[PDB]
């Protein structure tokens, strides 16, 4: 009941801020996070429903679920902790990302930020595998918040009510592609959709299997 | 110069407070720090020993002891102010942690010995082994988040209840700690530490002053 | 299934050798190692005790006030396969890591046992890191004890492997992770060992511990 | 004691290695090359940038241009001597790496620029932004295990192929390395190291001597 298939499972995705108020100051506050699988079969969604909040073009995600493997495909619902003070300072906005696998292979992760299904920023990061704890693991540690992300997330807490943010996200999605590179299959895709949390825990996700019907 | 000999060189000292208030939201404040750098300086200033022998423990493993074995260019007094600007969110998801790391070009088994005082009597002792890592082509020796004993926490909390840091300087005045690192196999003194403690009131939040120890 | 309940897992337990022969060359061999299919198979505790203590605070009386659930036996195929060039820059250590959902002050009770009496007791205190949606207990390198370096120096110098498996039937090592608020055991892993004659290296076999 | 550094950027690490897992349980780290971190004392030895010239590339972009803009105190010339002394074991999992480390006083977004050279000629280039992390007093630039391009995997199996060293010295004649650091607000340069390769006549050992860049 996690994101992974035989060839490569999600260890950890956290998107965070970083904040250096003095030199005896740090803070670290978490905007979304998923965890490492932990021992019912998981919901499945029909992928037609998400088709129009993603890019449908050459190489687009109807195309990259047609040539499979499908089970490599999740739809991510992430509610948002927005619940942080942010400060004039060094900030640092980052995403870390873990992935572990049974094989040695060099591993494209491609990031596409969406804004009404047509792409608005894509990022690419190749990762060599590191042999940790009897498994092979990918690491994209800190890597920088482009100012298209800063700026979006800025703009939401200005707004006074978490159902204008949610509004707002019903347009934004981000596509996540982990490729073996010398093969070029797909070894995880994430379509990521987004609310604001108004839980006291913070944030929150519900992982789904993308199938046809 | 810095708290160093030929044998044994100061790197990191760092005394803080992490606090996990939910899954989201992390903090690390620091209350003191010193780390080594590399000096544009003139030599470190020198104060006479004997100034100090009642502020620490003496009799037998005592600090006038210590300086008498030698050698005289591995004892040093700090002078820490200390950060005390952080809200103790009652204890939730709290550690009171000190980190310390060292360096030399030799490979040795050394013992770190903290004796924190009052009035010039011990009140705890926390004695840590630790052995060489071969890092950036020197061996380094790391205590890597040691937790605070209760004693320590509790006289944090204990500071922090008064309203001013008058009152605060005038507790501190009697408090002291003397770190001594020693070669286990042939315990030779490496470096040996006298601190004293004051409240920082700067903006830029926790200072420290190191002087040599001297007889004169 | 493994080594874990609702209350703390074992990620990833690792005994090893570092040497450091110049300023360019670093080797780590693993001795044993356990990181983290059926259900794990049952070993009645009984046929166990007489290999551990069996005082106050013995195996028998912690495994009494329970929960059974914690308690395992590992059995380790030790890998000696190494050149102990010499103790030359050598460092010889043991690396744990636990999560949980609680966070807790944890006490890690690791026993050293000849002939079901202990030789040695190291008790190491460790506090959580929330790494990951997660409470972790890492001890990161801590040395090995005298007796252990020269225990395996000796089973080495033995020139057949079933002497060495002989002398290693009357050697356990019992760990005890407890929660030191409320004294309540986590985790208690009973380790029996035997040398691999594999080539893929150190194995290890997990059994849960019942009474019948 | 020589230290590549100016008051707004010092070299902390610079390390090249090669990791080997033959199996689960035996894990080896060699290093080609490595400098550590190092502090009156009388300047370093001069070279002069001309002489270099044409072992780095030229025109819009190149040495002379970057040292034309300054400042001169950023300017080194680094030569290696190799530790080459190490079995490659047949598909045994290996990582080839470059760990390095910079520290400042001041908190920037640094560019590094890495350009490897063959007859004075960019073979590859790899481009690697850091932000900083105040550790222990400063702010710190790390770029931690960064993969060996397969130009440089291939050009070392190639060197350690050939019977003697002085073979591997000729044919790193025309081998050198321009390694850049850049604030990328500002575009100042903060670093920049001329990189020339010998093997090191040692069995086991790397060394390595600094000079200053002047006109
Ligand atoms: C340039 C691309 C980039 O900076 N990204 C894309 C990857 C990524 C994924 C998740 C997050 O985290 C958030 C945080 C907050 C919200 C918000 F505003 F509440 F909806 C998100 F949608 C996503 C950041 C990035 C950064
Ligand atoms: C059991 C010993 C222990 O926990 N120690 C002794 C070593 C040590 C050294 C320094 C600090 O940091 C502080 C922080 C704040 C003050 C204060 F409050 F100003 F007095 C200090 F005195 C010392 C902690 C320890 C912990
Ligand atoms: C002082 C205690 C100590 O040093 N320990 C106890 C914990 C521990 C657990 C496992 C190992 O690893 C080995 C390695 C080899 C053998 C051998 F030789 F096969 F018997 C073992 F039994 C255990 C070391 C320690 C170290
Ligand atoms: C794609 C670029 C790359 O992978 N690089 C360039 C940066 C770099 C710097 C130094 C080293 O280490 C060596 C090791 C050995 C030799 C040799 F062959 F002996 F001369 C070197 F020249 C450089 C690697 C890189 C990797």
Redesign the interface.
Known sequence: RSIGTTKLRL??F?AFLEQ?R??????????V????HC?PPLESVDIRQIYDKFPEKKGGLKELFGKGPQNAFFLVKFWA?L?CNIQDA?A?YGVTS?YESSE?MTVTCSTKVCSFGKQVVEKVETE????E???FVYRI??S?MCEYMINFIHKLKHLPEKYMMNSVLENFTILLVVTNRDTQETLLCMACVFEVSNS????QHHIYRLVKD
Do not use: M
């Not at 060599?128 to 042999?131: G, H, S």
């Open positions: 260890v950890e956290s250096q003095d030199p005896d100051s740090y803070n670290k506050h978490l905007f996070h998923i965890g490492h021992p902790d619940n060094g640092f873990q040695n060599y595998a590191r042999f704890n009897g498994r540690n800190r920088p006291e825990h913070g944030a």
